[PDB]
Amino acid sequence: RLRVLELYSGIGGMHYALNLANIPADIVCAIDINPQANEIYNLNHGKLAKHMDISTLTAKDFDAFDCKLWTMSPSCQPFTRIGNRKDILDPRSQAFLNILNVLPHVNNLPEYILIENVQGFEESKAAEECRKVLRNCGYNLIEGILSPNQFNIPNSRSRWYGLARLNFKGEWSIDDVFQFSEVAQKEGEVKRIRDYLEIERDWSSYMVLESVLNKWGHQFDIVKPDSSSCCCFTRGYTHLVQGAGSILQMSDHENTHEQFERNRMALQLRYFTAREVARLMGFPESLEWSKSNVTEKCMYRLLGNSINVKVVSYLISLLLEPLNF
Ligand SMILES: Nc1ncnc2c1ncn2[C@@H]1O[C@H](CSCC[C@H](N)C(=O)O)[C@@H](O)[C@H]1O
């Protein structure tokens, strides 16, 4: 079976994607500094997540893990750091550079590496350093930008992905991943928002406040159940308006802008629930947090930093093909 090290594990999107890809995978360790993430991780996947600063990992640590696949969703922003006080710096994006500095020292280089990051990572100095050390350590690296709405998922979430195979001299391309998306177009199989919504819940706690709608309401992106996309969810969702996620019109008004000026409260606008956000990001229904100390408000923040499980399941399948499972 494949021993996997899941770095920057969060609530375990990578583990869920490995499950979908039917990889016989043993997550040897999941590492995250956020105890709230680890609490959700361990409740759902088993006690595999450990509290550890990835910037302190040594080659002896990686040797003990002895993992053939490493996954990571590192924290690399800001891509260009400012400031002369390199003395007092907390290890932030130092953790990713620590991985790159320690990798050439391990006893057994991992045969497969999967890296996920935000769009624009590809132009960063960190990406330049990553390509350099991977090339020097004999990896074949392919990379690309992919969004769920390329796979018939009605959500925008463009992300950079790097897939690396050690000592691989064949031919592959990130675009091969589309041979896995069963999706086609018939217009009745095109997924829309309604396919992810919860139904007949009490929406009171999710209704957008009139105070926010009166002050900033023109900045919302409003979608309806029949919409074929919605905007990217972030940590700011339900707190910051612009650029943090779309909201849902529950009323039947066809002309949303016209009704907005007439009476914006009659649009019955609500936030997506955290369950709906999880569904749009490809998490299965088994994902649970009710039995934890983690509130739905905190779940929005954890989900805002999570991968799309569906997209990564396809990339994992592509990455691990030479293992002939
Ligand atoms: N130096 C460091 N050491 C360990 N974990 C870190 C870290 N810096 C950031 N992280 C963690 O890395 C995660 C980046 S978001 C990744 C979440 C995960 N990919 C998922 O799908 O759920 C956050 O949970 C954050 O707590």
Residue numbers in the entry: 6 to 330
Reproduce the article's own wording on this structure.
For further insights into the activation of Dnmt2 by Q we solved the spDnmt2 crystal structure in complex with S-adenosyl-homocysteine (SAH) at 1.7 Å resolution by molecular replacement. This structure comprises all amino acids from position 5 to the C-terminal end, including loop regions, and exhibits an overall simiIar fold with the Dnmt2 crystal structures from human (hsDnmt2)16 and the pathogenic amoebae E. histolytica (ehDnmt2)17. In the spDnmt2 structure we were able to build a loop of 20 amino acids starting with Cys80, which was proved to be important for catalysis in hsDnmt2 and therefore is referred to this loop as the “active site loop”. Analysis of spDnmt2 electrostatic surface potentials unveils predominantly positively charged surface around the SAH indicating possible interaction with the tRNA phosphate backbone. However, the structure exposes a strongly negatively charged cavity in close proximity to the sulfur of SAH formed by the catalytic residue Glu121, which is also conserved in hsDnmt2 and ehDnmt2. This cavity might accommodate the base of cytosine C38, which needs to be flipped out in order to be methylated. The modeled Dnmt2-tRNA complex reveals Q34 positioned close to the active site but simultaneously too distant from the catalytic residues to directly participate in the methyltransfer reaction.
Here we demonstrate that Q34 of tRNAAsp solely is sufficient to increase Dnmt2 catalytic efficiency.
